[PDB]
Amino acid sequence: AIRKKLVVVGDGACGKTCLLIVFSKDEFPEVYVPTVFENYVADIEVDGKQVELALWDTAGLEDYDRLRPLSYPDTDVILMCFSVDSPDSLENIPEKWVPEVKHFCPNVPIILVANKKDLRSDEHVRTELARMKQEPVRTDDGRAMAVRIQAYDYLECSAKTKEGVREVFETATRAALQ
């Protein structure tokens, strides 16, 4: 089988680990524990081809910035994540994530991924973000960012409900195989 390396990046708490773990082990972590760094293995079949995906998880917290470049060498595809409960996480895509991945992973395709899409309909999220004059990130603005940064693709998912998760990894695998 073909081996490919996937690296996920994005703001702290934006759902990276839950996405990788739902996809690699079909389980959703109950308690939020910030990542330091670690990786996973998943087998995937896409378009008839068998691929062993290595899924490299990174810490989004700025406190672990110095560790992130440990994961980037020899990456075949980048999942660049934000979450819909955090408008700031989308703003940080062009301000932080794009420049960093361009530097360390030149010419590696980027899938821009909106995580936690279930929270668009969560009344508590909507109520509290509205209290702060915000709202869940809308598809149109994710897509616009994907155009701005010339992402290989734009996808939305929920690790919690599993909606869209397989498609993120199928699309990433295609990007890695191109």
């Epitope: 702290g12 708490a13 934006c14 939020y32 917290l61 406190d63 409960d85 999220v125 509290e128």
Partner: nanobody, 125 residues
Framework: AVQLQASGGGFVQPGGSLRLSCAAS????????MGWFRQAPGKEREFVSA?????????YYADSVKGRFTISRDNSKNTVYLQMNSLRAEDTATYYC?????????????????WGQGTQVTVSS
């Protein structure tokens, strides 16, 4: 799994007063050390005040609110109050209460599975 809920916010004139309340709900280990946090558009989330196991006037206060804000416990109702006096425009923010722990002090988004209800305080001419 115990979650802290904020109430008592409103519109106030500069120099007025307001008392916020932080109530506990859900099941789990008691929260011994809790804090008040506030969030205004554009600025970073700000720690305001906290109270732990020791009663009395010595508590934890941001310099921004020292002498104007007083944090205390109801002694009967498992509720923390933030008495806010001499309010100023700079105090306008959405106020939340939460346990004091590594997750609540970390520089990252509000996780609404962990934060409860906020309460808006607007100070205005």
């Amino acid at each position: 799994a115990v979650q802290l809920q904020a109430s008592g916010g409103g519109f106030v004139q500069p120099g007025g007063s307001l008392r916020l309340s932080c109530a506990a709900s859900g099941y789990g280990s008691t929260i011994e050390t809790m804090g008040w946090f506030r969030q205004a558009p554009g600025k970073e989330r700000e720690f305001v005040s906290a109270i732990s196991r020791a009663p009395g006037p010595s508590q934890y206060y941001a310099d921004s609110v020292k002498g104007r804000f007083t944090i205390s416990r109801d002694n009967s109702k498992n509720t923390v109050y933030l008495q806010m006096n001499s309010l100023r425009a700079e105090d306008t923010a959405t106020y939340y209460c939460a346990p004091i722990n590594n997750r609540t002090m970390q520089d990252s988004m509000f996780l609404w599975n962990y934060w409860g209800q906020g309460t808006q305080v607007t100070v205005s001419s």
